[PDB]
Amino acid sequence: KPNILFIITDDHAYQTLGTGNNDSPVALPNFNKLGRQGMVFDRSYCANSLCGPSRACILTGRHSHMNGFVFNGQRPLDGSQPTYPKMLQKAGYQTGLFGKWHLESDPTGFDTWEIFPGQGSYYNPDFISLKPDGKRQTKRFPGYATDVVTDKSIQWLGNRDKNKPFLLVVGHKAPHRAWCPALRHLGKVDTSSMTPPANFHDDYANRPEFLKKNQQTVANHMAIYSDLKVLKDQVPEEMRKSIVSPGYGWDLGELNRMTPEEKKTWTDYYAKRTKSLVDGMKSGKLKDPKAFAEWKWHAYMEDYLGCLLSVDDSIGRLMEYLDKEGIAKDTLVIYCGDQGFYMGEHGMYDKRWIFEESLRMPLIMRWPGKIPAGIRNNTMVQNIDYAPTIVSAAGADTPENMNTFQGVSLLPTAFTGKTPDNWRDAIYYCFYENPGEHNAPRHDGIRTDRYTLSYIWTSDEWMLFDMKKDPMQMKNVIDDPAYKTTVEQLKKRYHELRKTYKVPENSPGGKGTPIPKFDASW
Ligand SMILES: CC(=O)N[C@@H]1[C@@H](O)[C@H](O)[C@@H](CO)O[C@H]1O
Ligand SMILES: [Ca+2]
């Protein structure tokens, strides 16, 4: 019975996973090692690109409509339903959880837990925990969230009953907005040699009309002072009106959480960027909106990647303990980001879309002896598969537990690095957060090996992208006659998957419908 160390970041883009020569914009040595000692799944996707929905999928091995948590709303997750933590706890595991939970309800199946209230805070984080009395308390811990989460995790591991296999879930806030790096990492990231993606200035042509209404563009939807860290006090009052997108001028909340010592180190560094902005404005260069948008991009890249430096550190402190305790051969290590992120592709940030960047989520596994070390796996895997995989690896895959899952165990492919003969030809995706922050439409679809077919419910628009001929998904080929029969093929496959996954009709629902509520079912 192996231990299970499960590390889950918030908004980690696979473009920056750090496993190889093509996903390392910043060098992440410990990310690369875990790659070298294990398996990366380059074809790893989620079922709903949002933090709360994806966490519920991982937990239940079931799609959003089946597990009930379909968006980041104030409706708590049904913690009474079957979850792999509770399954493992029933198979003798000791269970622990530290950091981002974000499912509202008290975590079930976990002997220990201390989670952030909501998104959490990078600097001087608050934690919530039941007392031995079991009444929720809230305590603040000094330090940087990525460090403190690792601190608590490792401590919990050494205080563990070493005769029971453990489940430890390590949920980081990084790399999540507003992308505040640790003080020791300020300046360590140099983007001035980086070039925005080919479609940074995307005009949205040959894509559904609704995409022009998205509010997750680097150029028009970033808080200049909060996201991009600019200092208002050092910007001429005359200039503030020309640097702030309308409604996007709010302050950086983390500053209120820093101590004076901390607060100064931060402003001391970020006066450079603030000056760099003022220089590009008075010189006129930053007044061309396309230039301003690229400048925005570079700051965004600096701070996002900067955050990954302490994640990388976290990965190192956790992997070191495993080795010094001599249990790496008896520990399944799963790393993932709850879903992916736009690193400027289509001039966008965040997730929520069926487009490849946010439909993917980075997946890495290390099980020495069991999982071929150094393999990149191209099998199509989804976040609804994790729970059946954790349970199998735990010998708790009774027919009872396994039946509650819609995902497929990944051990066969994890053990060989290749696609088994009978593998799914397509996954199903569905996003429900409209109306919602960032104005993503309610939409769903399937992802096949070659294609992406999505129906946008909010705007009543279909879209097909041919990945073999268009991996940047810039030309909607639905309504191209060459793909006529393909659309027919796919549309049937689409409706078949909806029927197999027991998707309700009129879900996720178009503009005339409320965001659906579901009771958990299995
Ligand atoms: C201002 C801000 O932080 N906005 C973020 C948003 O971008 C993100 O999508 C959401 C949860 O993912 O949390 C919001 O708070
Ligand atoms: Ca997330």
Coordinates of C-alpha atoms and ligand atoms in Angstrom, one line a residue:
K1 CA 0.0 0.0 0.0
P2 CA 1.8 3.1 -1.3
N3 CA 1.8 6.5 0.3
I4 CA 0.1 9.2 -1.8
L5 CA 1.7 12.6 -2.0
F6 CA -0.6 14.8 -4.2
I7 CA 0.6 18.3 -5.0
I8 CA -1.9 20.7 -6.6
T9 CA -1.1 24.2 -7.8
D10 CA -3.6 27.0 -8.6
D11 CA -3.6 28.1 -12.4
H12 CA -0.3 26.4 -13.4
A13 CA 0.1 26.5 -17.2
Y14 CA 1.7 23.5 -18.9
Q15 CA 3.7 26.0 -21.1
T16 CA 5.7 26.6 -17.9
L17 CA 5.7 23.1 -16.3
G18 CA 9.5 23.0 -16.6
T19 CA 9.9 19.3 -17.6
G20 CA 11.8 19.9 -20.8
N21 CA 13.2 22.3 -23.3
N22 CA 9.8 23.5 -24.4
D23 CA 8.0 24.3 -21.1
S24 CA 10.8 26.0 -19.2
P25 CA 10.5 29.8 -19.8
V26 CA 12.0 30.0 -16.3
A27 CA 14.4 27.2 -15.1
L28 CA 12.6 25.0 -12.6
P29 CA 15.2 22.4 -11.5
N30 CA 13.0 20.5 -9.1
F31 CA 10.2 20.4 -11.6
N32 CA 12.7 19.0 -14.1
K33 CA 14.0 16.3 -11.7
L34 CA 10.5 15.0 -10.9
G35 CA 10.1 14.8 -14.7
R36 CA 13.4 12.9 -15.1
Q37 CA 12.4 10.5 -12.3
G38 CA 8.9 10.0 -13.6
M39 CA 6.2 10.5 -16.2
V40 CA 4.7 13.7 -17.7
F41 CA 1.3 13.4 -19.4
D42 CA 1.4 15.8 -22.3
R43 CA -2.2 15.1 -23.2
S44 CA -3.7 15.8 -19.8
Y45 CA -7.0 17.7 -19.7
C46 CA -9.6 18.8 -17.2
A47 CA -13.5 18.6 -17.4
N48 CA -14.4 22.2 -16.3
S49 CA -11.5 24.8 -16.4
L50 CA -12.2 26.4 -13.0
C51 CA -10.5 25.8 -9.5
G52 CA -13.6 24.7 -7.5
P53 CA -15.1 22.5 -10.2
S54 CA -11.8 20.8 -11.1
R55 CA -11.0 20.1 -7.4
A56 CA -14.5 18.4 -7.2
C57 CA -13.7 16.4 -10.3
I58 CA -10.4 15.2 -8.9
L59 CA -12.1 14.3 -5.6
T60 CA -15.1 12.4 -7.1
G61 CA -13.9 11.0 -10.4
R62 CA -17.1 12.4 -11.8
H63 CA -18.1 15.3 -14.0
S64 CA -19.4 18.6 -12.6
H65 CA -23.0 17.9 -13.2
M66 CA -22.7 14.5 -11.5
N67 CA -20.8 15.9 -8.5
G68 CA -22.8 19.1 -8.1
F69 CA -20.0 21.8 -8.0
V70 CA -20.3 23.4 -11.4
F71 CA -18.9 26.9 -10.7
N72 CA -17.1 29.0 -8.1
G73 CA -20.4 30.0 -6.5
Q74 CA -21.4 30.2 -2.9
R75 CA -23.2 26.8 -3.0
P76 CA -21.0 24.4 -1.0
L77 CA -19.9 21.0 -2.3
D78 CA -21.8 18.0 -1.1
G79 CA -19.2 16.5 1.2
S80 CA -21.4 13.4 1.9
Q81 CA -20.9 11.9 -1.5
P82 CA -18.2 9.4 -2.5
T83 CA -14.7 10.9 -2.5
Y84 CA -11.3 9.2 -2.9
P85 CA -10.1 10.8 0.4
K86 CA -12.9 9.1 2.2
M87 CA -12.4 5.9 0.3
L88 CA -8.7 5.9 1.2
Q89 CA -9.4 6.8 4.8
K90 CA -11.7 3.7 4.9
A91 CA -8.8 1.6 3.5
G92 CA -6.5 2.5 6.5
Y93 CA -4.8 5.6 5.1
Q94 CA -4.0 8.6 7.2
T95 CA -5.2 11.6 5.4
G96 CA -4.0 15.2 5.4
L97 CA -4.8 18.4 3.5
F98 CA -3.0 21.7 3.6
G99 CA -3.8 24.9 1.6
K100 CA -6.3 25.8 -1.1
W101 CA -9.6 24.0 -0.8
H102 CA -12.1 26.5 -2.2
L103 CA -15.1 24.1 -2.2
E104 CA -16.9 25.9 0.7
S105 CA -17.9 22.8 2.7
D106 CA -15.8 21.3 5.4
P107 CA -13.4 18.7 3.8
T108 CA -14.4 15.1 4.3
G109 CA -12.2 12.1 4.4
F110 CA -9.3 14.0 5.9
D111 CA -8.0 13.2 9.4
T112 CA -6.2 16.6 9.3
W113 CA -6.9 19.8 7.4
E114 CA -6.0 23.5 7.3
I115 CA -7.3 25.3 4.2
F116 CA -7.3 28.9 3.1
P117 CA -10.5 30.9 3.4
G118 CA -11.5 31.2 -0.3
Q119 CA -8.6 32.1 -2.7
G120 CA -6.1 32.6 0.2
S121 CA -3.4 35.2 0.5
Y122 CA 0.3 34.9 -0.6
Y123 CA 1.7 37.0 2.2
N124 CA 1.0 36.1 5.8
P125 CA -1.8 33.6 5.1
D126 CA -4.8 32.8 7.3
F127 CA -5.7 29.2 7.8
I128 CA -9.0 27.6 8.9
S129 CA -9.1 24.4 11.0
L130 CA -11.5 22.6 13.3
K131 CA -10.2 22.5 16.9
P132 CA -10.2 19.2 18.9
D133 CA -13.6 20.7 19.9
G134 CA -14.5 20.9 16.1
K135 CA -15.7 24.5 16.0
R136 CA -14.0 26.4 13.1
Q137 CA -11.1 28.7 14.1
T138 CA -9.0 31.0 12.0
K139 CA -5.3 31.6 12.7
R140 CA -2.8 33.7 10.8
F141 CA 0.7 32.3 10.0
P142 CA 3.7 34.6 9.2
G143 CA 5.6 34.0 6.0
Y144 CA 4.9 33.4 2.3
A145 CA 2.0 31.1 1.5
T146 CA 4.0 28.7 -0.7
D147 CA 6.6 28.3 2.0
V148 CA 4.1 28.0 4.9
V149 CA 2.1 25.3 3.1
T150 CA 5.2 23.2 2.6
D151 CA 6.2 23.9 6.2
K152 CA 2.9 22.5 7.5
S153 CA 2.9 19.6 5.1
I154 CA 6.4 18.3 6.0
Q155 CA 5.8 18.8 9.7
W156 CA 2.6 16.8 9.4
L157 CA 4.5 14.0 7.6
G158 CA 7.1 13.6 10.3
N159 CA 4.4 13.6 13.0
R160 CA 2.5 10.9 11.1
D161 CA 1.8 7.3 12.1
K162 CA 4.5 5.7 10.0
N163 CA 2.7 2.3 10.2
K164 CA -0.2 3.7 8.2
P165 CA 0.1 4.7 4.5
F166 CA -0.7 8.4 4.2
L167 CA -2.6 10.6 1.8
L168 CA -1.2 14.2 1.9
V169 CA -2.8 16.8 -0.4
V170 CA -0.6 19.9 -0.9
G171 CA -2.7 22.7 -2.4
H172 CA -0.8 25.8 -3.3
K173 CA -2.2 29.3 -4.0
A174 CA 0.6 29.9 -6.7
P175 CA 0.6 30.5 -9.5
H176 CA -2.8 32.3 -8.9
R177 CA -3.7 36.0 -9.3
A178 CA -2.4 38.4 -8.3
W179 CA 0.9 36.5 -8.9
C180 CA 2.9 38.0 -6.0
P181 CA 6.5 36.5 -5.9
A182 CA 8.3 35.8 -2.7
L183 CA 10.7 38.5 -1.5
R184 CA 13.8 36.4 -2.1
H185 CA 12.7 35.9 -5.8
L186 CA 12.1 39.5 -6.8
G187 CA 14.4 40.3 -9.7
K188 CA 15.4 36.7 -10.4
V189 CA 13.2 36.5 -13.6
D190 CA 14.4 38.3 -16.7
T191 CA 11.7 38.3 -19.5
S192 CA 13.4 41.0 -21.6
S193 CA 14.5 38.1 -23.9
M194 CA 11.0 36.6 -24.2
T195 CA 8.6 37.2 -27.1
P196 CA 4.7 37.1 -26.7
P197 CA 3.0 34.2 -28.4
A198 CA 2.3 34.4 -32.1
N199 CA -1.4 35.2 -31.4
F200 CA -0.9 37.8 -28.7
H201 CA -2.6 40.5 -30.7
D202 CA -5.4 38.2 -31.6
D203 CA -8.3 40.2 -33.3
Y204 CA -10.6 37.1 -32.8
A205 CA -11.4 36.7 -36.5
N206 CA -12.7 33.3 -37.7
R207 CA -13.8 32.6 -34.2
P208 CA -17.3 32.7 -32.6
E209 CA -18.7 36.2 -32.2
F210 CA -18.8 35.7 -28.4
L211 CA -15.1 35.6 -28.0
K212 CA -14.9 39.3 -28.7
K213 CA -16.8 39.8 -25.5
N214 CA -14.3 38.0 -23.3
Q215 CA -12.9 39.9 -20.4
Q216 CA -9.6 38.0 -19.8
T217 CA -7.3 39.9 -22.2
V218 CA -3.9 41.0 -20.9
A219 CA -4.4 44.4 -22.7
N220 CA -7.8 45.5 -21.4
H221 CA -8.7 43.4 -18.2
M222 CA -5.6 43.6 -15.9
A223 CA -5.5 45.8 -12.8
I224 CA -2.5 48.0 -13.5
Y225 CA -1.6 48.4 -9.8
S226 CA -2.9 45.1 -8.4
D227 CA -2.1 42.6 -11.2
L228 CA 0.9 44.4 -12.7
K229 CA 2.1 45.8 -9.3
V230 CA 2.5 49.4 -10.4
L231 CA 2.9 52.0 -7.6
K232 CA 0.2 54.8 -7.8
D233 CA 2.1 57.1 -5.4
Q234 CA 5.1 57.2 -7.8
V235 CA 3.0 57.7 -10.9
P236 CA 2.2 61.4 -11.8
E237 CA -1.5 62.1 -11.1
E238 CA -1.6 63.4 -14.7
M239 CA -0.8 59.9 -16.0
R240 CA -3.0 57.6 -13.8
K241 CA -6.0 58.1 -16.2
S242 CA -4.0 56.8 -19.2
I243 CA -2.6 53.6 -17.5
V244 CA -5.7 52.2 -15.9
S245 CA -8.4 50.3 -17.8
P246 CA -11.9 51.5 -16.7
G247 CA -12.9 49.9 -13.4
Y248 CA -9.5 48.1 -13.1
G249 CA -7.7 50.5 -10.8
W250 CA -8.0 48.7 -7.5
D251 CA -5.1 48.4 -5.1
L252 CA -3.0 45.3 -4.4
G253 CA -4.6 43.8 -1.2
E254 CA -1.4 41.8 -0.3
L255 CA 0.4 45.1 0.6
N256 CA -2.1 45.5 3.5
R257 CA -0.9 42.1 4.8
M258 CA 2.8 42.8 4.7
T259 CA 4.8 44.1 7.6
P260 CA 6.6 47.4 7.1
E261 CA 9.8 45.5 6.6
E262 CA 8.2 43.3 4.0
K263 CA 6.1 46.1 2.4
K264 CA 9.3 48.1 1.8
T265 CA 11.4 45.3 0.2
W266 CA 8.4 44.9 -2.2
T267 CA 8.0 48.6 -3.2
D268 CA 11.8 49.0 -3.2
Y269 CA 11.9 46.5 -6.1
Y270 CA 8.7 47.5 -7.9
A271 CA 9.6 51.1 -8.2
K272 CA 11.7 49.9 -11.2
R273 CA 8.6 48.8 -13.1
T274 CA 6.6 51.8 -12.0
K275 CA 9.4 54.0 -13.4
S276 CA 9.6 51.8 -16.5
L277 CA 5.9 52.5 -17.2
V278 CA 6.2 56.2 -16.6
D279 CA 9.2 56.3 -19.0
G280 CA 7.3 54.5 -21.8
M281 CA 4.3 56.9 -21.3
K282 CA 6.1 60.2 -21.4
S283 CA 8.3 59.0 -24.2
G284 CA 5.1 58.1 -26.1
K285 CA 6.1 54.5 -26.9
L286 CA 3.8 52.9 -24.3
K287 CA 1.0 55.1 -25.6
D288 CA 0.6 52.8 -28.7
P289 CA -1.8 50.3 -27.2
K290 CA -0.1 47.3 -28.8
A291 CA 3.2 48.3 -27.1
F292 CA 1.5 48.9 -23.8
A293 CA -0.1 45.4 -24.1
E294 CA 3.3 43.8 -24.7
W295 CA 4.7 45.7 -21.7
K296 CA 1.8 44.4 -19.7
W297 CA 2.6 41.0 -20.9
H298 CA 6.3 41.1 -19.8
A299 CA 5.4 42.2 -16.2
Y300 CA 2.7 39.5 -16.1
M301 CA 5.3 36.9 -17.2
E302 CA 7.9 38.1 -14.7
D303 CA 5.6 37.8 -11.7
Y304 CA 3.8 34.6 -12.8
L305 CA 7.2 32.8 -13.4
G306 CA 8.5 34.5 -10.2
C307 CA 5.8 32.7 -8.3
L308 CA 6.9 29.3 -9.7
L309 CA 10.3 29.7 -8.2
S310 CA 8.9 29.2 -4.7
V311 CA 6.7 26.4 -6.0
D312 CA 9.8 24.8 -7.4
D313 CA 11.4 25.2 -4.0
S314 CA 8.3 23.6 -2.5
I315 CA 8.7 20.6 -4.8
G316 CA 12.3 20.3 -3.7
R317 CA 11.6 20.4 0.1
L318 CA 8.8 17.7 -0.4
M319 CA 10.9 15.5 -2.6
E320 CA 13.9 15.8 -0.2
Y321 CA 11.9 14.5 2.8
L322 CA 10.6 11.6 0.8
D323 CA 14.2 10.5 0.0
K324 CA 15.7 11.1 3.4
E325 CA 12.9 9.1 4.9
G326 CA 13.6 6.4 2.3
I327 CA 10.0 6.0 1.1
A328 CA 10.2 7.3 -2.5
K329 CA 9.9 3.8 -3.8
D330 CA 6.7 3.3 -1.7
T331 CA 5.1 6.7 -2.5
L332 CA 2.9 7.7 -5.5
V333 CA 3.7 11.4 -6.3
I334 CA 1.1 13.2 -8.4
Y335 CA 1.6 16.8 -9.3
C336 CA -0.9 18.8 -11.2
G337 CA -2.3 22.2 -11.6
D338 CA -6.1 22.3 -11.1
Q339 CA -6.3 23.5 -14.6
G340 CA -4.2 25.4 -17.2
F341 CA -3.7 29.0 -18.0
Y342 CA -3.3 31.4 -20.9
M343 CA 0.3 32.7 -20.9
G344 CA -0.8 35.4 -23.4
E345 CA -2.1 33.1 -26.1
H346 CA -5.0 34.8 -27.9
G347 CA -4.0 37.9 -25.8
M348 CA -5.5 36.1 -22.8
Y349 CA -4.9 35.1 -19.2
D350 CA -6.9 32.9 -16.8
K351 CA -8.8 29.8 -18.1
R352 CA -12.5 28.8 -18.5
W353 CA -12.4 28.1 -22.2
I354 CA -12.4 24.8 -24.2
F355 CA -9.3 26.2 -26.0
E356 CA -6.3 23.9 -25.6
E357 CA -4.3 26.1 -23.1
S358 CA -7.0 26.0 -20.5
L359 CA -8.5 22.6 -21.4
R360 CA -5.1 21.0 -20.6
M361 CA -3.7 20.8 -17.1
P362 CA -0.2 19.8 -16.3
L363 CA 0.2 16.2 -15.0
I364 CA 3.3 14.5 -13.6
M365 CA 3.6 11.2 -11.8
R366 CA 6.6 9.6 -10.0
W367 CA 6.4 6.0 -8.7
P368 CA 9.9 4.5 -8.7
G369 CA 9.9 0.9 -9.9
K370 CA 6.3 1.2 -11.2
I371 CA 6.3 4.2 -13.5
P372 CA 9.0 4.3 -16.2
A373 CA 11.3 7.2 -15.3
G374 CA 11.9 9.9 -18.0
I375 CA 8.8 9.2 -20.2
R376 CA 6.5 11.8 -21.8
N377 CA 3.1 10.2 -22.2
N378 CA 0.8 11.1 -25.0
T379 CA -2.2 9.1 -23.7
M380 CA -5.4 11.3 -23.5
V381 CA -6.1 11.5 -19.7
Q382 CA -8.5 13.7 -17.8
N383 CA -8.9 15.0 -14.2
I384 CA -11.9 12.6 -13.8
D385 CA -9.4 9.7 -14.0
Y386 CA -7.3 10.6 -11.0
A387 CA -9.7 9.3 -8.3
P388 CA -9.9 5.8 -9.9
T389 CA -6.1 5.9 -10.2
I390 CA -5.4 6.8 -6.6
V391 CA -7.9 4.2 -5.5
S392 CA -6.4 1.4 -7.7
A393 CA -2.9 2.2 -6.5
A394 CA -4.3 2.0 -3.0
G395 CA -6.0 -1.4 -3.4
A396 CA -9.3 0.2 -2.4
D397 CA -10.8 -0.3 -5.9
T398 CA -13.7 -2.5 -4.8
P399 CA -16.6 -2.8 -7.3
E400 CA -18.5 -0.4 -4.9
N401 CA -16.0 2.4 -5.1
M402 CA -15.0 1.9 -8.7
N403 CA -18.7 2.1 -9.8
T404 CA -19.1 5.7 -8.5
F405 CA -16.5 6.9 -11.1
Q406 CA -16.8 8.0 -14.7
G407 CA -13.0 8.3 -15.1
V408 CA -10.7 5.5 -16.0
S409 CA -7.8 4.3 -14.0
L410 CA -4.5 5.5 -15.5
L411 CA -2.1 2.9 -13.9
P412 CA -2.0 0.7 -17.1
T413 CA -0.7 3.7 -19.1
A414 CA 1.3 5.1 -16.2
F415 CA 3.0 1.7 -16.0
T416 CA 3.9 1.5 -19.7
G417 CA 4.1 5.1 -21.0
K418 CA 2.0 4.2 -24.0
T419 CA -1.7 4.3 -25.0
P420 CA -3.5 1.0 -24.2
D421 CA -5.4 -0.7 -27.0
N422 CA -8.9 0.2 -25.7
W423 CA -8.4 3.8 -24.8
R424 CA -11.1 6.5 -24.9
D425 CA -11.2 8.3 -28.2
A426 CA -12.6 11.5 -26.7
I427 CA -13.2 13.4 -23.5
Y428 CA -16.1 15.7 -22.6
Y429 CA -15.9 19.2 -21.3
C430 CA -18.5 21.7 -19.9
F431 CA -18.2 25.2 -18.4
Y432 CA -21.2 26.8 -16.5
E433 CA -19.9 30.2 -15.2
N434 CA -22.0 32.6 -17.3
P435 CA -23.0 35.2 -16.0
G436 CA -19.6 35.2 -14.2
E437 CA -16.3 37.0 -13.7
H438 CA -14.3 37.1 -16.9
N439 CA -17.5 36.6 -19.0
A440 CA -16.7 33.2 -20.4
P441 CA -19.7 31.7 -22.1
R442 CA -21.5 28.6 -21.0
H443 CA -20.3 26.0 -23.5
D444 CA -19.4 22.4 -23.8
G445 CA -17.9 19.9 -26.3
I446 CA -15.6 16.9 -26.9
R447 CA -11.8 16.7 -27.4
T448 CA -10.8 13.9 -29.7
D449 CA -7.3 13.0 -30.7
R450 CA -7.4 15.3 -33.7
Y451 CA -10.3 17.8 -33.2
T452 CA -12.0 20.2 -30.8
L453 CA -15.8 20.5 -31.3
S454 CA -17.6 23.0 -29.0
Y455 CA -21.1 24.4 -28.9
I456 CA -21.3 27.8 -27.2
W457 CA -24.6 27.8 -25.4
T458 CA -24.6 31.5 -24.3
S459 CA -24.3 32.8 -27.9
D460 CA -25.7 29.9 -29.8
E461 CA -22.5 29.3 -31.9
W462 CA -20.7 26.1 -32.9
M463 CA -17.0 25.9 -33.5
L464 CA -14.5 23.3 -34.8
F465 CA -10.7 23.5 -34.7
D466 CA -8.5 21.1 -36.6
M467 CA -5.5 20.5 -34.3
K468 CA -3.3 18.8 -36.9
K469 CA -3.6 21.8 -39.2
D470 CA -4.2 24.6 -36.7
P471 CA -2.9 23.9 -33.1
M472 CA -3.3 27.6 -32.2
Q473 CA -7.0 27.3 -32.9
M474 CA -7.3 30.5 -35.0
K475 CA -9.7 29.3 -37.8
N476 CA -13.1 27.8 -36.9
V477 CA -13.6 25.2 -39.6
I478 CA -17.2 24.3 -38.8
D479 CA -19.0 25.3 -42.0
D480 CA -16.0 24.6 -44.1
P481 CA -17.2 21.9 -46.6
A482 CA -14.0 19.9 -46.2
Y483 CA -15.1 19.1 -42.7
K484 CA -18.8 18.6 -43.3
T485 CA -18.7 14.9 -42.7
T486 CA -16.3 15.5 -39.8
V487 CA -18.8 17.8 -38.1
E488 CA -21.4 15.1 -38.5
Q489 CA -19.1 12.4 -37.2
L490 CA -18.1 14.6 -34.2
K491 CA -21.6 16.0 -33.5
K492 CA -22.8 12.4 -33.0
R493 CA -19.8 11.5 -30.9
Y494 CA -20.6 14.8 -29.0
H495 CA -24.2 13.7 -28.3
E496 CA -23.1 10.1 -27.5
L497 CA -20.7 11.3 -24.9
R498 CA -23.4 13.6 -23.4
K499 CA -25.6 10.5 -23.2
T500 CA -22.9 8.2 -21.8
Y501 CA -21.9 10.9 -19.1
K502 CA -25.6 11.3 -18.3
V503 CA -25.5 15.1 -19.1
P504 CA -28.9 16.6 -18.5
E505 CA -30.6 18.1 -21.6
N506 CA -30.6 21.9 -21.6
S507 CA -27.4 21.7 -19.6
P508 CA -25.2 23.8 -19.2
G509 CA -28.0 26.0 -20.5
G510 CA -28.1 29.2 -22.7
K511 CA -28.8 32.8 -21.8
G512 CA -32.4 32.3 -20.8
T513 CA -31.5 29.8 -18.1
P514 CA -30.1 30.1 -14.6
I515 CA -26.7 28.5 -13.8
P516 CA -27.9 25.0 -13.0
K517 CA -28.0 23.4 -9.6
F518 CA -27.4 19.7 -9.2
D519 CA -27.8 17.1 -6.5
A520 CA -24.8 14.7 -6.4
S521 CA -25.4 11.4 -8.1
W522 CA -23.4 8.3 -9.0
Ligands
LIG1 C1 -9.4 40.1 -9.1 C2 -9.1 38.6 -9.1 O1 -8.3 38.2 -8.3 N1 -9.8 37.9 -9.8 C3 -9.7 36.5 -9.8 C4 -10.1 35.9 -11.1 O2 -9.3 36.3 -12.0 C5 -10.1 34.4 -10.9 O3 -10.6 33.8 -12.1 C6 -11.0 34.0 -9.8 C7 -10.9 32.6 -9.4 O4 -10.2 31.9 -10.3 O5 -10.6 34.7 -8.6 C8 -10.8 36.0 -8.9 O6 -10.7 36.6 -7.7
CA2 CA -7.5 27.3 -10.8

